[PDB]
Ligand binder design. Structure first.
Ligand SMILES: [Ca+2]
Ligand SMILES: [Ca+2]
Ligand SMILES: [Ca+2]
Ligand SMILES: [Ca+2]
Lengths: 21, 21
């Protein structure tokens, strides 16, 4: 549902932070 | 690349809109 979608977005956000580090 | 990451996010968003509908 919607919170599983938000959790996916947070995993992606974390990955991007690491990419950009 | 950044914009390719944003376009991916946009596809993910369009698919969640449909699911939530
Ligand atoms: Ca949560
Ligand atoms: Ca969380
Ligand atoms: Ca986190
Ligand atoms: Ca674009």
């Amino acid at each position: 549902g919607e919170e599983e979608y938000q959790e996916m977005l947070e995993n992606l956000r974390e990955a991007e932070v690491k990419k950009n580090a």
